[model samples]
Target chain A: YTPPGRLGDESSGPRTDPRFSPAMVEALATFGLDAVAAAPPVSASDDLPTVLAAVGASHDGFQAVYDSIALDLPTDRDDVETSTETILGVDGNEITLHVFRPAGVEGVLPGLVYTHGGGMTILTTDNRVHRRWCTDLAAAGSVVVMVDFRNAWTAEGHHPFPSGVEDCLAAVLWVDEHRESLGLSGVVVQGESGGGNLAIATTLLAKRRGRLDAIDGVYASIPYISGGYAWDHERRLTELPSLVENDGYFIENGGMALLVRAYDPTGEHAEDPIAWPYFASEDELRGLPPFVVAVNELDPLRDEGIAFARRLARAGVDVAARVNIGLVHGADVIFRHWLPAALESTVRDVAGFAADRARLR
Target chain B: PGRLGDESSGPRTDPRFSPAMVEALATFGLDAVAAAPPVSASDDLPTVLAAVGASHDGFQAVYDSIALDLPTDRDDVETSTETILGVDGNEITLHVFRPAGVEGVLPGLVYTHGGGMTILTTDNRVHRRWCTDLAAAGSVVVMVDFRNAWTAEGHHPFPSGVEDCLAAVLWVDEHRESLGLSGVVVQGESGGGNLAIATTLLAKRRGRLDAIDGVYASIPYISGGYAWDHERRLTELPSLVENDGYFIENGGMALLVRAYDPTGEHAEDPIAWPYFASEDELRGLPPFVVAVNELDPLRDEGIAFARRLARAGVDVAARVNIGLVHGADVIFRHWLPAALESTVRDVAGFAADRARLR
Candidate 1:
């Protein structure tokens, strides 16, 4: 029998915990009313397929709402140029890469390779918030490469284990191989939520492939580091007031249970380092680039991010971590449209780190 | 039971395994050996009383050797002296290191020196350097010479060390305005690290915790957390390897444990062993910055305590200096200059950050 609230088990029901800050509650009030207009609720009796379908439908509805908001927003930046291209992966698959370049930036500039968060199910670069955040990063003086990986829920493809990570690795390698022509001196890997998992895994993959010399730093915003025992342990250890208080809103435990099952059905690939970087041993973490992890105050993933940062520091890696007070998971992109100040500070910090790494040459 | 290498027998043999750190092999220096020759070791297979007595004598011997080559004074920085009458009626003297050009109110730090609850006085040049560097960062530093728990010297027991630390913090809080300080950050290295935490916990109990802003525990001696765990299981962790061999062996620890609390009681008290403190006790702890040394016997406990602090919802910043051992900053300064610079910078920077909150 699976654990309570785990995949294949009944949900624990809606939580009445009030863990949100005034800013978080205000932003969430606008967020719930404007985006998705209240997501469809998932019952404890719902199966994996039923939950996935409900999640997909909710995101699709949220996409329409996001587009409506985008219509009135001034997204065009005078200092940045945006374009897209398709790159053929080592697996013979084509992946879309969104490139954002700062205008009039001379000399070889710093590069940011980014991945989007969807729990390996949905979301893309075309998502309004992703587009805006990526554009702002480019405007801050680094060339951004946002890789669009294959989703597990797509009807046309059966992409599963290693598929998402492969796309991220392909983008990183492409950035390194074409750095001179792309006018880039160094690269910093970045992502949020599930993408945060992919970003760290891809960096470790780069290290194993002996390509870490080209990378400078990592910005894992509200990262998902573990999925099995480590995740189970952290779930039991989580005591953050925000997470305990805001249980049913944003991304809840039931939502996470569904995502974990979908990401690793049968739990066969849960121990793979590429799938879960939290299990990466001491030697695996050593000699890598410095990392800056930003965790949302209300995020369930906060403790895991802090644990990973501590492990990295123990391994002698230069790392810094900060809890983004009064925010929830995916705030880096989701709240960028409404609550932009904190998101802007995060961008400046990451971009500054990237610039420092660029000077390493 | 008759094994000569075990604790019942004495210190274990094997110099490489002792964790005393090897010199001459300079190329493989630990992360923070900025400058100084590799430290020399004292012995193996010695009794607890003999070992502790020898360890104290060895420090004195080493001090004498270094004193001949050291200068009596430096042209850099000025300092002052302050006195406070303790609740125990013992007059506590404080050495103040002040930076030049004091405009308005500056931040303050209550600094404590390291001697592993035994040897050393507050007037040493090494102690002077620690205070000067900290005060140089725009904060007035008050280094307290707490009553040591040396049984040989006829000093009192376990809670007394903590009692002195509490008095020092109270003195700092009482004189905050006269010192021209906005807030206070308690800073210590080695055994002093243990005092820093104890002082903070005591302040919380006394309802004076609100006056303090942050804590800096630099390689603190907090081994009580692991003392209750199974011996074999602890050996699996790298830091515990040192306890079985050099510097302060298990037998040596047994002596200090007895010396601190002679009756073998109060061992579980949170004030005596902060690591074993209940969740409720930890919840009251202020923000902390914990630094650990890679080869120190107390490294694992330090990490364990830091992890506990974070879980308790306390804001924590923890970092480990790779390849360095306990008290390495003071012992290996001549050869490990670069490593020491980074270590000092990490501490001073954290103190400055904490001071800003005031």
Candidate 2:
């Protein structure tokens, strides 16, 4: 048997990794990466315009595959009505919020503030995956609101640090303010990848400003919290083995590091909890609302997510965690056709969290 | 009601522990581990000896209070014993357990019990049931009765204890056919975990690596860093701080290490403190399974040892069990039967698999 981290082909990739789900192995082999080796070292030097232009091309390549997947067996939930609204953000910029609520439902329900993945420097909530996810979560018995907050690097502009974070916080504060009109009793921030970073960062900011009551819960999946990518290459391999063991499984470490730099060009807030929730102190994490942290077993960012969960429990926070065996980063959303169970379960859990937290209140 | 009213003092309960483990704390008063006086703080060896004796007795009594009452005789397992003469001309006893009415020769697990190398013994009720469980799963479980540092006979130190373990292994190897064993695995937990590793290192030094097929160590107390000052101990082994007083305190752990190496001369010696073993010493060793407990202070040292063994080209399998204190699998077997069964069967499976490979 070949060792992990070095297997670069179907014959030796998921199909052979003992930890992988045997059922999903064949499917991954049929439609997987052309190359399982690390990509060429990334160069992310650019104008906010240059970075956005470069990343959009790659996003389009993935959008093609994702769109095709959605085209086949897609759930266009007509029962869940969608509406868009904009409000002035903490930065004086207009932040958009996409609301998806179950149609003809009159009773009050919990509200979920959805944030999309971009590693803090890419992607918006306008994608097909984010749209379907919001609809599905809303249909599961809650109001799902997808936030189109400013990203650190965007096609329109680059808004780093507090700009995107404040927009998300402001968006949640707005949801809480309009709970009566929206027919909601509670608010939850849920996100994956870059959005996962925001869900946690926003909560940390909420607690520091003594406005934590605006939200009741948080669910972050495959959170890229650790700035270990900023550490020396050799040190990261030792500190976080999955970064090397699952290097090219779905994401590459080298490219992820480039995204980290684009988000914080000067690396000034590398250890600041506001920028990296993984570095949050016990004092900062204490008394926070219940947290559900889920990590993918085959993802490079696995350890960091687990480490944060352990830290949360250590801080007296009501934290629960799980490892999604055989899945990579955002697989539940990306391959909803194949992993319907994971997607459905993810939705039901978050919706239940919002309702349960509200009912308990 | 308040254990540490001041926030500056630290958490009342070690937050690093799992909720279940922290709940188990009331069963045994471990919250005061760090506050206990170090047994090794004595200026004289005999004084150190008595304090450790008191510590071991108190440690054993609580676990025995809630221990699962097991039938001494089993329908599916046969138990026996054998004694061998150590190289130093001391006698050693090993309790042997094998599957009842099994036909062929099976792999052997030469188990060393955990006591932090100073106290505890293989004849304890906890150790006996563990061997029976391993024997039932698969493999011929041979539990070693080596010389403990603070034994009734006299104070035996470093090489004396390790030598007896190797003597037991060598005897097992020389008589494999007679004992119906196809392979030999050195396994243990806590101090016994230290012995499992130390004996293998000693065997390698004596050019007798052929005697051992593999090593399975659980919650190994290899680092001897427990007694180091607050700053360095937490920096290198943060579990020592985070999981402190979950079951055992760092001050108490230091007493055990001092008991094994009275002069501190062999503090960093690989054979004495296997955590200090270099890659060269570990290069040609057999495959290893290093199991660390999340709520154990020695968790990082065990993981670090596995990392080094892997880098040295040894096939190493490292696992971490959440919500457990040091040696809780064996000690709290009654309370946590699921974790106990998983560990026991896993140890047997690894030993059986290694034997077949050879």
Candidate 3:
């Protein structure tokens, strides 16, 4: 059952949900726009714990339901894992952990802690789309720890933000705390849509906590920073729709609004700056590690995302903002499209810039 | 609106001051050069010190200090001098040099040697070194034995030296290909450096300066109203001026005399000495590589001119020989290597750029 008294209960229709917007839909159409098509069969027998590890709304819940639907998977499915480490310290619901080093993988590989896209709702890393992204990161020489952040739908989370942030941070700190055991010195933070917000928030929190030495940089793809304009007819055209366009698949008419309302703790329509980043103030953006931001032009959030870059530059932060003119929100979700190559290229660019910064001395 | 003439086609301010630089730095806006072309050897700069009635006698010291060592070895490269004019209808000689292995149509160099505004010859000991270097370096070096203004009565008078230099530049430009050459790079050092700048400026005015990539004003005497005011600074900073006022005084006084003619007219008038005039005739002038002696009397003027060029948005490189005093060419032989290296590299680079572009 859906969680009672959630923000989704207080939201409006598709008119305010950017997913159902005209421009985004048209842009996404170029990439074979489809809504929740049947997923190709996947094998997750032995690694069901790991596969299901990304299932539930948040880490614990996903770990809870991970076993049931997991079929014994063949080695054919693209996948990678690392040596495993246990919880040195578990603080409340947070799992202070270490990595599971993959067999036959060698050297200092790029480590990625990816947070799946959603307004803390809608999907988990097992949603096929998130899994492929994680797969791509791993395939491209990365050790990915794709998170199953707290969702408004699964377990009754006292506070979704805390639950998600705690899980994301726990994962990052765990990997970094045991980096030597995992054999990777390079660590990168990655997120798409709502996951981008969480990654940004996690990176910022890490920076403030003086742990930036553990993070290489943040690669955010059409991240959802705020939902303030979720109710505004004009803002909806560019905001929510652009995000859904990111996946190149529609969120159905009321899908996104339902997701946001379900996650927002505040009953009032106040768009959290984290959820709707366009409203984030300049000062709050300082000290963020280097950023590689990709915004879809046809998606309404294109301008705001670019403005975020300019703000970072004015503050003397190293940032690269690009607008994939032909892409809609979630366009990378379409494996058939060439845009995912662009996303991977962006990751390399982020690493290069970060490397340059590190080598500046 | 004008006939699109050389350097004269556009309004001075429009062409002189490149708007590009002004946008970069407002101190000397795009219109600065157009309003007034970069004035080097204007004498007014030195006049600033002269206004305070500063007095010094270092000119004759520099004139006497120079050691002329003309090449006796043909293998070392030699030059023949012929005086074109002299004081009292006296004739001045021109030193002609032929570079070895330069057979068919080699590039030509029109060199004017330096000494402040007085006390040196194209065949002056040091200038002869340059002539040999130039001839050996590549080009057919022609050192003009223009009348040196030893006592202000030479044929190479106030504007006369400037005029004769301009004539030689025109000659090279007109006969570049016929002289079995490629192009011309007017080379001058010290006062002769001043003469080189003025000559180029005049060439532009007379619509005669052409096929020339640029000018190398090495240790140019930029101050027109020559007055060496560094007796105290030199005393305080010995490393900068080991030779003391000898070089400055020798060079500074003559520049002072020329700054104020008998009529009290500005000796830097563009018509009289194009180099000292405003940037009116400086538009589209070739790129410049101006060097200055860090401790020389001409240091300040050199810096000011370099800044002026940058402000004007001209592609210019300024190099300062920071620790060397004026006329210390022979004193610091090791230091000259870098200067020579940079000069040759920059000149070759500039030539390559223009050759490809033109």
Candidate 4:
């Protein structure tokens, strides 16, 4: 309303509308995304260890989220612990593989080769989020082999998916080869987001080479598989944690697109089915293990994942699924929070389905 | 009796809903177990929608999630039957609650329930009160009992539910003269809020009912729009257990899945029809009076739907009641001085531009 250099637009003046924050926007533009327009905010040396401790305290505070709900127990099954030795997996320069098992179990137990999700960039086996998942799955009476897959943007390259796939397949072959000694009858490759992509790709490779009849199944959450979306749409999905949030939308579509363009080994096979499972064949889809595709509505690739599952089912694979409402991509990664119930629901369905399949076979 | 029993193909679906479910549903009622209810509406719709809309739009900005299509469906109420016609597919049951007096061509309000299509009720006290208040405000209110497939065993009503409500409006429009109602105003709380706005969009798509004058959408359960709000709800769950578990736990979480996919197929059921039902169909919809309550798990849905309506160029009047809980209207009978007063105010405003049918 005064000078021509006014920081904001015509409607920038203050008002009672709580949602309007043009002034705040102008201030931030002068600063940055997380920048404080005014005095001191978020200093670089704000004590890292203190942040870690605060995270712990927050966990302690949130323990009640778990304590309040009665654990869901299936009348047909009881929680048991078991493990398998010599679980198969690929070891590439970029990624490594390690599988866990319970000690001294003689008979067959359902199997899960788990690949964790962190947008294919920041995840590791040691991540508390991933580790918690391992404990939960293992506790639910299955032989869970945690895959220490590759992280994104490693020194080797940005396209970490090939190695991730290699490691995951290696784990599955190892599990199947030593199923008897490891006390496992059936196996399911489970992952979230990028890990979810690897899970499907692994199954594709398993069937391609005819390594095993099929995985018990594939359990995936928010698999990142889509044509690139518009910037406005992408921004919306990733700004927070909805599928519109960064975890699924940007990570799967945008990030993977860039990574693929960067790391096509054969160069000529840039669109190879192995490189991008989203483009895999119907025959490849047929060999995929029975699947549990858990998608988020806001996720850019949710529809894609569902399409793959539908195609798989039409190709004669049994697929069960659950779509978490209002959940963003990678919501399952923070399974310790409100996602436990969803996780339990998912696991219960997958485990029961796996057991049933094994029995039928 | 198994639908998928190819006999040669192993024992597929065990055929028949669970016996435990059967016994429970047979005897289920309000008095089975004496218990408290979930938290009612907390904050007003404006505040809740603002927070939810901001958060929703923010996340959409960050991840760039775009709605390639709008969920616009043509829903029409049928004559001599409780059947609802939906644009996508499947039939829904719409229960209509008519007010006592019929003043010449007064206003009429159509309501849709939230819960993502999993849980719904035409008999909810909150809805009933809102309906009566609309009637008292000199309007007729129609409460819809659309299909619910959460635990219900039948053709799921996810996309179909929205379609049915839209059809109901057309049905109401077709009989607007006979019912002595002026312009049709659609309303809903939570899932109903979603249904109400979604219905508006559907009307525009059909190009038939241009007579829709106003919308009263309360706490719509817009899909994927409540990520942060849900996060907050999750964080605040421990503190929300003062009354009963239904509101937060059962009412909130249980209804989440259905809102996203009304058909119980979970992931996009390709075989499951009515998925990807678009909303682009709503071109010139009417104005909206979105009423919301804070502390409701579904507050985010209402906001997102309203925002979508506004973006579609519909005039929107946001009404937010502060410090209220989820479904507060039902918590305190709609007769409560404040709750009823707010209800009447929204109805009167909605009826403002409408000319009496008489």
Q: What are the per-model numbers of colliding residue pairs?
A: 19, 1, 61, 83
| Fraction of true A-B contacts recovered by candidate 3 | 0.00
Q: With candidate 4 superimposed using the best TM-score fit, by how many Å does residue B110's alpha carbon deviate from the native? A: 33
Residue-wise C-alpha lDDT for candidate 4, range A158-274, written one tens digit per residue: 444466667667767766776776667777788877678777777777777877564766777677544233235545334322323222221233333333333342345445666
Give the range where candidate 1 chain A is weakest over 10 consecutive residues by summed lDDT: A1-10
Candidate 3's residue-wise lDDT over A1-361, tens digit each?
1111111232422223322323333334443443332222322222433322233333343233322222222212354563333442224553423232334677766566777775565454555455555554565456667655555556443344446665777678877786676656566777777777777777766766787777766777666665532355445444444333322133322334434455554434344454455565668677666666666543434445655655654444545454443344565454212332234334344333333233321
Model 3 lDDT tens row, B191-304: 677777777776776676565666777777655544233464233222222222322343434444444232337455643333354544555677676766544545545555
Q: Which candidate is the best by DockQ?
A: 1
Q: After superposition, how far is residue B240 of candidate 2 from its true place, in Å?
A: 2.2
- Give all candidates' CA lDDT scores: 0.64, 0.75, 0.49, 0.47
What's the TM for model 2? 0.56
Model 2 score (lDDT): 0.75
TM-score of each: 0.52, 0.56, 0.39, 0.39
lDDT of 1 by residue, A153-185 (tens): 564554666788888888888888889988897
lDDT of 2 by residue, A1-361 (tens): 1234443333445545545443344435545652363553345544544544555555555556655554223433558888899999966788888999999998999889987887877665687778888887887678988988887766556667868888899998999899898889888899998888999999988888889999888989789888666466577656676776777776776567667767777778889988888889888898999787878767889878877887776676766565554466777778666554345445545666676567656
Tell me what TM-score chain A of model 4 achieves.
0.64
**Candidate 2 docking: what grade?**
incorrect
**Candidate 2's DockQ:** 0.02
Q: By the DockQ metric, which is better: model 2 or model 3?
A: 2
